């Protein structure tokens, strides 16, 4: 089972909203190359390679953990799409 | 009230069978010693097996030989039962040659004798040959451990050579019995008897000793709780290519190269010595 | 795609009678139907396998 | 091609008992008679 | 909580174990009930083989 | 096995090619004498290289081999080589083909200045080179440089004098010190295969 799935279901009125939030956040992370993360260097998800510990490539895991932290704000009509995208591209270029 | 070193009795019949008794032992230790040895004896005991087979004018395993009753598959199957003993401990592989013809039943004895190689089961049948039937073959027998399928090793001495499933383990069977015994004052004590059946290549006592040695060596692992490639060093390109193709690929070897070695290299001169020195200045 | 192949069950100079087996066909042992193998089986659960 | 028995292959007897090979254990893991003889196949009694 | 859930005075069977699973789902949530399921599986099998 | 001194020949053009040679120590040059009397360096034989290759195909040597340093060579009988030896010979001959082709390219690339710089830098990676307090150096004459840069002594001397005045190199007693490796590298442009 996914870690803290019950608590994640707790944060939303509908599971599907959780899914949408996670997916979209994952899209943000992928688009901006993880440099917009709310996580701390010790909170970063890790993956064991032959070399050793590396950053987890999976953005969904990242998004779910980030959501579990509470530092993310989700809802409807929080901000116009264009303004959001441009401010994100200003804070975290591509 | 501490038990002392038990008596160890040995009863052997030839090289194929053995019984090893240890008594008395504390209650429950019969299976404690007996069982792990059995697992090792069945799995980890080194032995010999036919790893390859080439039969003249035979292209593959599913071929058929004129003059011979048995098909190639059956022949290889018979060869799988061949027990080969290497007298020389340093010998890891041998190629046996066999040539026979006419109305004769080919046995293991017909193999051309090789030094430090003993065939334990010379009565083993290989193939029945008819008038005009000709069997000329070379089998490659290697030393190894466990069970390695034909697909895994893929050993071929030549093109038409057929890889054979290698059953290395010389140990045929292992059983152990735990029986009641008493040391005067203490009862319910354990008597351990280990019965080992082998193919004759290795002796039951030898197999047991190797097993115990393996177990001990593995027990040592509970002790401790809890030189780079030049190609990667980032040195000059000429250094990379020259040094590499000059039989060395590391700083250890570069260190080994004395004054009358490094400067002897055809590629190396002074421009190289510069970069090299710099490298030795970066690492020390 | 199964292999149908016959193997000789007799030897040179053997005296055979009328209706006696000469060669075994596929999936047969000494003239008897061989659809499989005879194995030593134990009836018991094993680690959920 | 020579096909060795492997995991996923299907076995059956003449009484209608059928099943797929899920695990091939090394001989040392196999249940065995007191005299050291290991069994070949392990069948679940729940099928009977 | 575990001590509360279990019926100790009775032999475990399909119904009791099903009730156990459900109660575990209600009280402890998805993840913990999943872990409990894996445990029940593991020990269940483990004992089933040696049971004779 | 035989040792040769500087300027001594291992074999001469037109002489019987009964012996194949392998250079163990030092530096050897394979050269040809032209009708005008000009001497030309055809290729460089480094330690480990096989030369006198004519013994493998012909009856006589076609070119003259001269030792540039104190040299140690090993004589070999072609007909007495095994599989491994033939493999080594093939590999080494291929390498010498690559290097002689690179040398070919070098001879026709850039002005005299560039060719001289490139040849000096090449010699820096040969047994002809050594080093002291003044810096790295190579023991070579202007005549030999001319022989290996498709030119004549006078012009080589002039260009070397220019390089000395510019501070890139210094020269005395058939001995040339390379003071500015970077500048020489820039002058040469592309390096010449030393291995």
């Amino acid at each position: 089972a996914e870690p803290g799935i019950d608590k994640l279901f707790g944060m939303v009125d509908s599971k599907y909203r959780l899914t949408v939030v996670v997916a979209k956040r994952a899209q943000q992370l992928l688009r901006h190359g993880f440099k917009n993360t709310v996580l701390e260097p010790e909170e970063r998800p890790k993956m064991q390679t032959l070399e050793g510990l590396f950053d987890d490539p999976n953005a969904v895991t990242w998004a779910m953990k980030e959501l579990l932290t509470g530092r993310l704000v989700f809802g409807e009509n929080l901000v116009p799409e264009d303004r959001l995208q441009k401010e994100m591209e200003r804070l975290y270029p591509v | 009230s501490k038990l002392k070193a038990p008596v160890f009795t040995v009863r052997t019949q030839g090289r194929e069978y053995g019984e090893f008794v240890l008594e008395p032992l504390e209650r429950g230790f019969g299976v404690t010693l007996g069982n792990p040895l059995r697992r090792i004896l069945l799995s980890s005991i080194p032995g010999t097996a036919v790893t390859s087979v080439y039969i003249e004018d035979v292209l593959h395993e599913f071929s058929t030989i004129p003059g011979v009753k048995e098909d190639v598959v059956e022949i290889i199957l018979n060869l799988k039962e061949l027990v080969v003993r290497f007298l020389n401990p340093s010998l890891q592989t041998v190629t046996l040659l066999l040539k026979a013809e006419g109305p004769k039943e080919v046995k293991a004895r017909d193999f051309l004798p090789v030094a430090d190689v003993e065939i334990m089961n010379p009565d083993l049948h290989i193939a029945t040959l008819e008038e005009g039937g000709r069997l000329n073959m070379e089998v490659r027998v290697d030393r190894g451990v466990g069970y390695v399928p034909a697909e895994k090793h893929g050993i071929k001495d030549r093109i038409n050579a057929i890889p054979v499933d290698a059953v290395f383990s010389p140990v045929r069977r292992v059983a152990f019995q735990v029986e009641d015994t008493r040391l005067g004052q203490r009862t319910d004590l354990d008597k351990l008897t280990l019965r080992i059946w082998t193919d004759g290549s290795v002796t039951p006592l030898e197999a047991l000793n190797q097993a115990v040695e393996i177990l001990r060596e593995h027990l040592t692992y509970f002790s401790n709780p809890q030189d780079l490639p030049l190609e990667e060093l980032g040195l000059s390109t000429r250094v990379l290519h020259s040094l590499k193709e000059e039989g060395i690929e590391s700083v250890r070897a570069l260190l080994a190269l004395n004054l009358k070695d490094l400067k002897n290299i055809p590629g190396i001169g002074e421009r190289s010595l510069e970069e090299i020195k710099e490298a030795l200045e970066k690492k020390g | 795609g199964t292999a149908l192949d016959q193997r000789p069950r007799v030897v040179v100079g053997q005296r055979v009678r009328k209706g006696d087996l000469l060669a075994d066909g596929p999936a047969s042992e000494n003239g008897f139907l061989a659809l499989g193998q005879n194995v030593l089986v134990a009836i018991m659960p094993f680690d959920g396998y | 091609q020579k096909r060795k028995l492997q995991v996923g292959d299907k076995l059956a007897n003449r009484h209608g008992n059928k099943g797929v090979v899920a695990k091939i254990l090394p001989v040392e893991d196999m249940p065995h008679l007191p005299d050291g003889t290991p069994v070949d196949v392990i069948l679940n009694p729940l099928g009977v | 909580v575990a001590w509360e859930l279990i019926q100790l005075d009775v032999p475990q069977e399909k119904n009791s174990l099903k009730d156990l699973v459900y109660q575990a789902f209600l009280r402890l949530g998805m993840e913990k009930t999943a872990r409990l399921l894996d445990a029940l599986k593991y020990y269940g099998f483990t004992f089933s083989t040696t049971s004779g | 096995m035989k040792r040769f001194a500087r300027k001594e020949t291992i074999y001469l053009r037109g002489e019987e090619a009964r012996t194949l040679y392998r250079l163990e120590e030092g530096l050897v040059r394979v050269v040809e004498l032209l009708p005008d009397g000009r001497l030309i360096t055809l290729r460089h034989v480094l330690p480990g290289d096989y030369f006198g290759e004519e013994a493998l195909e012909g009856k006589a040597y076609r070119y003259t081999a001269e030792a540039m340093t104190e040299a140690v060579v090993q004589g070999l009988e072609p007909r007495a080589m095994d599989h491994e030896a033939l493999h080594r010979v093939a590999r080494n001959l291929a390498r010498q083909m690559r290097r002689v082709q690179a040398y070919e390219a070098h001879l026709q690339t850039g002005e005299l200045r560039a060719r001289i710089a490139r040849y000096l830098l090449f010699l820096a990676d040969t047994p002809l080179s050594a080093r002291d307090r003044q810096g790295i150096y190579v023991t070579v004459s202007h005549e030999e440089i001319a022989d290996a840069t498709a030119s004549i002594r006078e012009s080589v001397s002039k260009v070397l004098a220019d390089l000395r005045r510019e501070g890139l190199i210094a020269t005395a007693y058939r001995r040339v010190y390379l003071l500015d490796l970077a500048a020489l590298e820039r002058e040469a442009g592309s390096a010449l295969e030393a291995a």
Side-chain angles (χ1 to χ4, degrees), chain C residues 38-46 49, chain D residues 23 25 37-43 45:
Chain C
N38 300 289
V39 289
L40 199 60
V41 69
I43 306 188
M44 61 172 298
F46 194 90
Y49 288 114
Chain D
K23 192 72 180 183
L25 305 165
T37 308
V39 299
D40 295 317
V41 177
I42 320 173
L43 296 179

Side-chain angles (χ1 to χ4, degrees), chain B residues 24-158:
Chain B
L25 294 167
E26 287 290 341
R27 180 185 69 95
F29 272 85
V31 335
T32 295
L33 289 187
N35 178 72
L37 292 184
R38 175 181 184 272
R39 295 178 61 82
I40 297 169
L41 282 161
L42 290 176
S43 65
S44 301
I45 301 303
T48 69
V50 173
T51 58
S52 196
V53 163
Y54 167 74
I55 310 178
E56 187 180 348
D57 296 323
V58 168
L59 303 175
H60 53 77
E61 183 174 2
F62 307 98
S63 303
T64 169
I65 310 179
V68 180
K69 180 183 181 187
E70 291 82 356
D71 47 271
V72 177
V73 180
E74 182 168 26
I75 298 177
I76 294 176
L77 247 39
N78 296 332
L79 292 165
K80 286 179 61 179
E81 300 287 344
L82 183 63
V83 182
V84 177
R85 176 185 181 184
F86 291 172
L87 289 311
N88 190 0
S90 302
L91 205 51
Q92 293 213 1
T93 174
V94 178
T95 299
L96 273 63
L97 296 106
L98 187 137
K99 295 178 184 62
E101 35 177 13
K104 68 174 303 175
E105 297 183 4
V106 183
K107 308 299 181 181
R109 354 175 148 269
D110 299 341
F111 277 112
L112 292 179
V114 181
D116 295 357
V117 172
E118 179 184 356
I119 291 149
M120 306 297 302
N121 51 329
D123 281 76
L124 172 71
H125 183 270
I126 290 136
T128 304
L129 272 64
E130 205 173 9
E131 277 288 346
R134 293 172 54 88
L135 189 59
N136 183 1
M137 62 171 180
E138 305 176 356
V139 336
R140 166 173 177 174
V141 175
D142 287 22
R143 170 178 286 145
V145 197
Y147 173 78
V148 181
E151 304 85 324
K152 276 295 173 293
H153 60 21
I155 302 182
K156 285 169 120 174
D157 279 342
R158 64 179 68 192

Side-chain angles (χ1 to χ4, degrees), chain B residues 38-39 61 165 173 175, chain D residues 2 4 28-29 32 35-36:
Chain B
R38 175 181 184 272
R39 295 178 61 82
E61 183 174 2
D165 295 320
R173 182 145 72 101
Chain D
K2 222 169 71 244
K4 266 172 176 51
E28 67 268 19
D29 293 13
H32 58 104
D35 58 6

Side-chain angles (χ1 to χ4, degrees), chain C residues 14-22:
Chain C
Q14 171 171 345
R15 294 227 118 262
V16 299
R17 295 196 202 95
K18 176 186 183 64
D20 278 19
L21 184 74
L22 291 178

